[PDB]
Amino acid sequence: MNIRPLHDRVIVKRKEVETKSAGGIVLTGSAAAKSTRGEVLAVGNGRILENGEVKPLDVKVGDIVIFNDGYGVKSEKIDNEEVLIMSESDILAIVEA
Amino acid sequence: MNIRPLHDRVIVKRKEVETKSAGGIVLTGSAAAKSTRGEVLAVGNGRILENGEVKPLDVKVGDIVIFNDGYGVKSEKIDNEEVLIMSESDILAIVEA
Amino acid sequence: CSDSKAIAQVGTISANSDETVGKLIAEAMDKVGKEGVITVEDGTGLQDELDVVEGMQFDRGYLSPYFINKPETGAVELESPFILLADKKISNIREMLPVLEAVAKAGKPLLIIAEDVEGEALATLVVNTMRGIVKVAAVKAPGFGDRRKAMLQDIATLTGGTVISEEIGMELEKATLEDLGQAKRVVINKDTTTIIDGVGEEAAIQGRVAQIRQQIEEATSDYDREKLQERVAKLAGGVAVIKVGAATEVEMKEKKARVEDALHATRAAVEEGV
Amino acid sequence: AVKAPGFGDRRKAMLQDIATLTGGTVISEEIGMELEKATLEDLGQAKRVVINKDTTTIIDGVGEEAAIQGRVAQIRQQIEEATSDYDREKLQERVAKLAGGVAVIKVGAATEVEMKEKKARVEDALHATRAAVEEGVVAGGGVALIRVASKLADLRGQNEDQNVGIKVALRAMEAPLRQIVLNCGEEPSVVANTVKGGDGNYGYNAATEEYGNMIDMGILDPTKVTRSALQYAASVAGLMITTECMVTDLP
Ligand SMILES: Nc1ncnc2c1ncn2[C@@H]1O[C@H](COP(=O)(O)OP(=O)(O)O)[C@@H](O)[C@H]1O
C-alpha cells in the first residue's frame, strides 16, 4: 500500500493549517488560500545528469518542507488518505527542528 | 528556527517603499516602485549543472541586493513575516555600503 | 416672526386654516433648530405625523445581516468604534488588511464606509466578526458618486478621520490609525446607519457648514438647496419629515400641497418677517 | 434533489425555515462553513418526504417545538411592514407551512362566463370574511349607517353651512338601504321609514321582502367594509363639491 517515487520525484502530504494567519495576529482569509507546507513521506532515487551518477535528492525523508504549488504537482489518494506527488525541482526549502 | 533553501535558491526580504528625495528632486508619488532591493536571509548549497557538482553561490548572507522579480520568485510568509524565495540566477548585482 | 406661536399662525393661514399643519411646522422648526431641514412625504395612514432624526444619520444598511450585534431589532451597535472612509469599492482584503490588524490590537471595533464592499472582502470580514476576532461593520457611502464623495468629507470631518483618496497619494494598503475617524457610538440596521457623538472638532464642523453656506446661494434652486441644506442638517442640526395623512390620493394631493405651501410660507416668515 | 422553494433572497430566508424545522443546519457559503465539509449531524431529519413534478413535501420535522415556535413567533416582527400584503401572503404562507396549513378553493362552473363571475363572488366573500374576523361585524341591509345617523342627529358644527354639511351626510347614509329596497321595485321611503320606526337591529330583508332582526336573520356586514366605504365616499365627494372651476383639453 506504500508507493515509492522514482528519480527526482518525492511524495509529501500537505498540512492543513487553514491558510492564514494573515499577516499577523490573527486573521482568516477566504480566497487565495491553501496549504503551502507539508511533511515528506517518501523520496525517489535521485537526479540523473550526464550519468555522472544519480545524485539523490538533497531532501531527506520526514522533513518538514516549504514548496511551490505548480502544475508539476499532482494529487493522488491512497487508502483512507489523499497525498501529493511532486518533483524536488518544485521544492523550495526545508524547515529544521 | 532557521529554514534552509535548497540548491541555487535563496530567500530574501523585500526592502522599503515610496521614493527618495534623490538630492531633493524626488518626492512621494502615485507611480509605485515595489522592492527592487532586499536583504538576504538564507542561501542554499549551490547549483548542480551537468556534473558541475555543487558551485557555492557567490552571494553571502546579510548582503543588500537588487533583483528582477518574475514568477521565479515566490512569495511566502515565514515567522509571520513576508518573504520572497528566488534563484541566484534571478539575482542581479550587489551593492556595497 | 420668531416665537413658535407666530410661526404656527402663518403656517395655519397659508395652509387654509388647518391648525394642525401650522402647529406641526412650528414644532418641527423648533426641534431641528435653524438650518435644520423639514420635508413632507405622502403618509401611510389617515393622521398627520412628524418624524425627527437628530444628529448624523444616513440611509444605508449593513451589507451582511451577520454583522448584527446586540439583536434583536436586527441592529448592530459599536461602542467607541473607528470609522474607515474609503472612496473606492472594496474587493480584496489584502489592501484592506494592515489597518484592520492595527485596530484589532488596538482593542476597538471598526466601521467601514465605501462605494461598496464586494464578496471576498465581505466574506473575510464576516468570518472574522463571527470567529470573534474583531467586531466590525460595513455600509455604503450615502449618495451617487459626486453626492457621496461630497458627503464622505462631511462624515470624515465630523468624526475627525481622513478619507482615503486613490486620486491623491494615499493608497489603502498604506493607512494609519490616524487616518481613521472616531465616534462615541454607531448603530446600523437593514435600513439606516447612525453616528452618535463624533469626535471631530466643533471648529471643523462649523468650518464645513460655513463652507457649505457658500454653496447655499448657488444659482440652482430646488433640490440643490434641498439636498445641500440636508447635509448641513446632518452635521449640526437635525432632519425632520412630515407625513401627510389622507383617505384617498386626491385628498393626499390637496393636503400635501397645502402643507408645502405652509412650509415655504413659515420659512418666509422666519426670513423676512410678517 | 429539488430546487429550493422561492425566488433567491426570500428563498434563502426559507432555507432556514426548512433547516430549523428538520433540525438540520443550512450550509451558508458566505460564512466559515465550507460546502465541501459537512457531517451527518449537519443534516435535517424528517418522518418521510414526498416529491412530484410540482411540489416537494416534508411529512414532519424532527426538531423540538421550542426553537421552532420560537421562530414562528419571531417572524411575526417581520409580519408588519411597508410591503402590505405582498410579504404577508408568502410570509404567512411560511408561518403556516411551519405551523398552520395552506388552503386553496377551486371554484366550479359550467362555462367561462359563469366561472369568472362565480370566482369573483368567492374572492369577495373571502375578503369579507377576513374583514369580519379582523374588525368584527354590524347589522347588514344598510341598517348600520342609518342607525348611527339616528344617533348623530344632535351633532352640529361651527356655522350654519357646516350644519347643513352634517345634515347632508346623515341624509346620505340612508342611501344604501333605499337603493337596496329600490332594486326590488319597492318604496324606499316606506321601508326606510318603517325601519327608522324600529330600534336596534330591526331591518328589511330584501330576499324575503319582509322585516325582522338582521343579526338573527344572519345578514351581516363586516364593520371594516362599512367603515371603509363610508370613509372613502366622504373623502372624494367632499372635495368634489368644492369645485368652482374645471380645466380640460378641447373636444
Ligand atoms: N338578503 C338581504 N337582505 C337585506 N340586505 C342584504 C341582503 N343581502 C345583502 N344585503 C346587503 O346588501 C349589501 C350587499 O351589496 P353588494 O350587492 O354585495 O355590493 P357591495 O358589497 O359592493 O356593496 C350588504 O351591505 C348587505 O348588508
PDB file of C-alpha atoms in Angstrom, chain B residues 6 13-14 20 24 26 31 38 41 52 58 70 79-80 87-88 90:
ATOM      1  CA  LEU B   6      17.953  24.118  -1.317  1.00  0.00           C
ATOM      2  CA  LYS B  13      13.069  40.083   2.432  1.00  0.00           C
ATOM      3  CA  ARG B  14      11.659  42.994   0.453  1.00  0.00           C
ATOM      4  CA  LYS B  20      13.648  59.079  -2.106  1.00  0.00           C
ATOM      5  CA  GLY B  24      15.744  66.758  -3.173  1.00  0.00           C
ATOM      6  CA  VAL B  26      12.181  63.355  -5.756  1.00  0.00           C
ATOM      7  CA  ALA B  31       3.621  55.742  -9.594  1.00  0.00           C
ATOM      8  CA  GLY B  38      16.316  43.397  -0.405  1.00  0.00           C
ATOM      9  CA  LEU B  41      18.043  35.830   4.913  1.00  0.00           C
ATOM     10  CA  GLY B  52      29.464  20.546 -12.495  1.00  0.00           C
ATOM     11  CA  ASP B  58      28.537  33.990  -4.989  1.00  0.00           C
ATOM     12  CA  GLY B  70       9.430  37.262 -12.260  1.00  0.00           C
ATOM     13  CA  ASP B  79       7.567  33.687  11.131  1.00  0.00           C
ATOM     14  CA  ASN B  80       4.512  35.797  10.215  1.00  0.00           C
ATOM     15  CA  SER B  87      17.079  31.632  -7.591  1.00  0.00           C
ATOM     16  CA  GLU B  88      20.549  33.210  -7.560  1.00  0.00           C
ATOM     17  CA  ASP B  90      17.305  35.779 -10.760  1.00  0.00           C
TER      18      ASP B  90
END
